[PDB]
Amino acid sequence: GISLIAALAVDRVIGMENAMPWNLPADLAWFKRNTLNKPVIMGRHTWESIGRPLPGRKNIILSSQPGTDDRVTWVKSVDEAIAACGDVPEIMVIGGGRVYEQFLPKAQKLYLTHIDAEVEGDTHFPDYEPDDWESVFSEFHDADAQNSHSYSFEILERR
Ligand SMILES: [Ca+2]
Ligand code: NA
């Protein structure tokens, strides 16, 4: 199916103009664990924030304009993005806000990191009602020497 994976500060903030004011290697490890060797769909701005392909995966970039890096696959519509993933057990949608908004109604699972941080942002994860979803996994973690804020992971499966 289609899954979304995202890291959310309070008020569902996911993005801003500058780099996020946190350091969460545990969230990166979680992202890798759940996307390894799966196709990833991302918007063009998320692509520019990474700068290079995520290894071992089909990288699919949504843009209305021709692609500018032949190392990844560029598509001009949601339907083309899904088609480019082919026949796979799980498609991972990795951001950003505009892309999450379009794929949420298609998604069966959400992988969410909730960060105990209040940050001014210009992009939010789309609204969802927790009652429409079942929490199948949850774990809370404190900040530590490597992670600047406390955070929790949850996996929600659409009811
Ligand atoms: Ca940004
Ligand atoms: Na899994």
Write the layout of secondary structure elements.
Blueprint: E1 2-8, E2 13-15, H1 25-35, E3 40-43, H2 44-50, E4 59-62, E5 73-75, H3 78-85, E6 91-93, H4 97-103, E7 109-115, E8 123-124, E9 133-141, E10 151-158
Parallel strand pairs: 1-6, 1-7, 3-4, 3-6, 4-5
Antiparallel strand pairs: 2-8, 7-10, 9-10
Calcium ion is lined by residues 15-17.
Describe this structure in words.
- There is one protein chain.
- This protein is an alpha/beta fold.
- The chain has a single domain (1-159), classed as Dihydrofolate Reductase, subunit A (3-Layer(aba) Sandwich), CATH 3.40.430.
- Helix content is 21%, strand content 31%.
- It contains four helices and ten strands.
- The protein has helices at residues 25-35, 44-50, 78-85, 97-103, and strands at residues 2-8, 13-15, 40-43, 59-62, 73-75, 91-93, 109-115, 123-124, 133-141, 151-158.
- The chain has an eight-stranded mixed sheet with strand order 5-4-3-6-1-7-10-9, with helices on both faces.
- Strand 3 (40-43), helix 2 and strand 4 (59-62) form a beta-alpha-beta unit.
- The chain starts with a strand and ends with a strand.
- The relative contact order is 0.27.
- Calcium ion (CA) is lined by residues 15-17.
- Calcium ion (CA) binds next to loops.
- This is Dihydrofolate reductase.
- Its EC number is 1.5.1.3.
- It catalyses: (6S)-5,6,7,8-tetrahydrofolate + NADP(+) = 7,8-dihydrofolate + NADPH + H(+).
- Keywords: Antibiotic resistance, Methotrexate resistance, NADP, One-carbon metabolism, Oxidoreductase, Trimethoprim resistance.
- Pathway: Cofactor biosynthesis; tetrahydrofolate biosynthesis; 5,6,7,8-tetrahydrofolate from 7,8-dihydrofolate: step 1/1.
